[PDB]
Design a protein around this ligand. Sequence first.
Ligand SMILES: *Cc1c(COP(=O)(O)O)cnc(C)c1O
Ligand SMILES: *Cc1c(COP(=O)(O)O)cnc(C)c1O
Lengths: 447, 447
Amino acid sequence: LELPADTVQRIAAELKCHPTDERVALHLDEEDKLRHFRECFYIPKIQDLPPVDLSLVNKDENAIYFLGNSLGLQPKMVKTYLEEELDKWAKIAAYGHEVGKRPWITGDESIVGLMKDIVGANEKEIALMNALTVNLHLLMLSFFKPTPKRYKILLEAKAFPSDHYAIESQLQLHGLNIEESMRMIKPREGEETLRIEDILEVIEKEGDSIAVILFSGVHFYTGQHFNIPAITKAGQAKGCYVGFDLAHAVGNVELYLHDWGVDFACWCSYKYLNAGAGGIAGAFIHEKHAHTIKPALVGWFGHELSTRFKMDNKLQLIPGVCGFRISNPPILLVCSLHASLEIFKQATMKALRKKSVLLTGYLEYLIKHNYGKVVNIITPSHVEERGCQLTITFSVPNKDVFQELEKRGVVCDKRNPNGIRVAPVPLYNSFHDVYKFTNLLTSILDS
Amino acid sequence: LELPADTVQRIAAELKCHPTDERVALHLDEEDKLRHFRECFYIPKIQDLPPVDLSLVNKDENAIYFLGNSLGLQPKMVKTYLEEELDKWAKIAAYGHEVGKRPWITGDESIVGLMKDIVGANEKEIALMNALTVNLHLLMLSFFKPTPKRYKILLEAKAFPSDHYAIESQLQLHGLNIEESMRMIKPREGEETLRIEDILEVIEKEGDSIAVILFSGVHFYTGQHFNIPAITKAGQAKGCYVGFDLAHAVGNVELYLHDWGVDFACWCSYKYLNAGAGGIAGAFIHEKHAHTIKPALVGWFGHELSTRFKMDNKLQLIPGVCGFRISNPPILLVCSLHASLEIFKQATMKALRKKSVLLTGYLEYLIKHNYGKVVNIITPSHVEERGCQLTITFSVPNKDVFQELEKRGVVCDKRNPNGIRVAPVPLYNSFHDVYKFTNLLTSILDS
Ligand SMILES: *Cc1c(COP(=O)(O)O)cnc(C)c1O
Ligand SMILES: *Cc1c(COP(=O)(O)O)cnc(C)c1O
C-alpha cells in the first residue's frame, strides 16, 4: 500500500504543484471523507487562548489544537446529552434509576456496546467505571499474585508517573523489594525509543520470574506505539500475564484486545475519546479469565442485576470484568462519554486510523522536507509504530520553540529541554491545520 | 428544650385549632426560616411519576417526595454550573486544567471548603473522589491490618449490602475465616434496632480482638442514628480503629468527625447532598493519622501539586487523606455537587437539623395520634437517635400500603412485608407535605 509521503507527492503531481504547496493540504481536506466531523466539536478561537500574543495572530481564526491526545475537544452534543439526564432527574427523580434512554442503574451498560469496535472486545469484557489508575489498581489486585519464583512486574522505563506509582505501591503491598522486583526496560545508549527485539529478549530471558507485564499501548513521551500482540504472545509464552495501559491508544490506534488474547487493560476517556476532564474510565478483561480471575475488592454493583436490589447480602458475583465494578455509575460522566462514542460510531476506527496515518504522515513529510538534518522526530518512522502523536526536538539555542508556538495559537505539549509533542487527530484536525503549523514552525526556526 | 410534639400542641393552642388541623402545618411553613430553599430545587409533578394513577390525584400538584434520603432532588443551579465548565472546555480546552473558577487539576479542592461544616473536619482531612464503596476499600486497605491477636471487623448485622460485600472481600484478601472474623451485632429478640449499651458491651468484651469497627452513621433500614462519638470512644478504648459509612448521615444529622476523634469515614453525595446519581463521593481521615496511616494504593494525584507535573517519577506523597486520591477529579461531578453545597452553605446544617427534628417529629406525632396501637414506627423515638427518615410497618393484611401510596404520588421506599421508609428533608419538604401524606395514609388505612 501507498506510503503517506508518496500519496502527498502523487497528489501534488496531479495538482501541478510542489508537494509543499498549500493546495495539497486543501485538496486532501476536500477528499477527506471525515471532513464533516470537525463540525461536531467546539474548536477554540486563537484570541481566547491564555498564552496567545494578539499582535502575532489573526483574530477569529481557529486555534491549531494539537493537544487532543491529552485533553480532547468537546463534542457539541455533550450538553444535549447532559440535559436529557438533568431533565429526567427534574421530572421523575428517583424513578430515573429504572427508566429512560439511560436508566441510571445501568447507565454504563447502556453505552458499553459503543466501545466494542473501539477496543475490539465483547460487551461482557468491557467495564466503564471509575478512573484510569483506579482501574489499574483494581485489576492488579487480582492479576498480580507474586510467588518466591515469579514476583516481578515488567514495564517500560520512564512510564507515565501514575502507572509508575501504582506499580510501586502494588509491589510494596506484597512487601517486595522495589529495585529487585520492578523491572524497567530502558532504551539503548543514544536512543529514546525501545526496539521490539530488545523487549522480547528481556521477556525471553527473564519471563519465568515475571508475574505481570504492564506496558503502555502508546508511550506518552516518545509517541511509540508498541506491538501489543507481539508483547502479549511473548509474555504468555513465559507464563506471564500481559496487560496494557491504553490511555494513549484507545480512540487513536486500532485495537483487537480479545482476538490478540490480551489478559487485561485499562484506559481513560478524556484524551482521544473526548469525554471531558476526569471522565469515566474503562477496563478490559479477556473472557477466558471470567471464572478464574475474581475481583479482589467487591461492592454491590458487582452483584448480578436481577437480585442486587433484594439486598439480602448474599453475593452473586457477575463473571468477568463487571464483577470488578464496585459502585453505582456516574450518569453525568456516562452522558459526556456517550456523546463522544456516537461520533466514533459514525466515523469508525478503521476510517479514523486511515486518516491519521495520512495526516501524521503529511506532518512528518513537511517537517523532514523543510528540515532534514536542527529538527529531530523521536517518534518511530514506521507508520505502524506510532499513532497521531509525534514527539519532536530542536537544536536552536536561542529559541524556545514551544513558547513561540503557543504565542501563535498552536496548542501542544512541551518536551524539555527544547521540544514539542503534537498530535493532530483525525476527528477534528485538518490537513490545512498541519500545513499552517509547519509554516509557523519554519518561520520560528528561521528566526 | 421543647419537644416537637409539644411545639405542635402549643402552636395549635395559639391558633385555636386541634393539633391535627391543616392550619398547624400551614403556620409551621410560614414560620419556617428555610421555606425559601424549596424554590432552589426541581420538584416532580404528580402526573409525571410512572406509578401514579391519574384518576386518584390532582394534576399539577407537586409530588410528595419523601425519597430524598436515597436520590436527592436536583438543585436548579446544577445545569448552570455544568454550563460554566462546558463553556470553558469549548473556549480554551486544555487550558481549563489550570484556569477558572474550578481549575480542573484542583476541581475537588476548589469546593472541599464547603464540606468543612457539613462533616466537621478541616480541609486537609476531607477528600472528594471516587465513589462511596470504592473509598471504603481505599481506606480499609490502610486501616485494616489484621494480626493473629487482632483481626476482626465489627459492624451491624443487616448492614447495607455494599459495605457487607466490601468487608467480606477485605477479610478474604487477608485469607481470614469470614464466620470467625466478621462480627455482626444483631438486635435482641423481638427488636429491630440496636441498644447502645449492647453495642458497648460487645466492644468492651471483644474489643481486644477487633482491628476495625466499621458502622453506618444512620442505619439505612431502621433509620437508627447511632451515637458516633460513643462508639468511637469505646472502640478506641480497646485499641480499635473506628470508621463510619456516613451515606445516610452526611447532610442529614450534624457531624463533628474531627472533634469526636473518628479515625476515618466515607460517604456518597447523591442522597441528602443532592449531587445526582453516582456523584463524586467523599472520604475523611483524622489529621492525627496524616503521617502514620499511608495510602495502600497510590496514583499521581496523591503526589504534591507543586511537583506533580514535573513527571520525574519521584513520589512526594501528600500527608493525610489527599495522599489516597489516585486520579484526576471528574469536573462534571464536581459541578453538580458544588451547586448543592452552595445551598447547604446558605442553609447551614444547624438550621437544617433544627427543621428536621420538628418536621420528622410532626410526622411522628400525626401518625401516632391517628394510629396509636396497626402502625409501628421502628425508628427510635428519641429525637437524637434518628435523622429525617422514619421506617414504618403496617398490620393491614388486605392493603399494600406502599402500592397505594405510590399510586397517589407519594415517593418513598418499600419495606417488606408491608411497610415504608419515608424521609422528609428540611431543604425542600414542607410541613404541609407531611400533613398531606398523613391524610393519604389515614385514608388508605381506613380503606
Ligand atoms: C447507598 C449506600 C451505598 C451505595 O454505595 P455506592 O458505592 O455509592 O454505590 C453504600 N453504603 C451505604 C451504607 C449506603 O447507604
Ligand atoms: C494520562 C495518563 C494517566 C492519568 O491517570 P488518571 O488515573 O486518568 O488520572 C495514567 N496513565 C497513563 C499512561 C496516561 O497517559
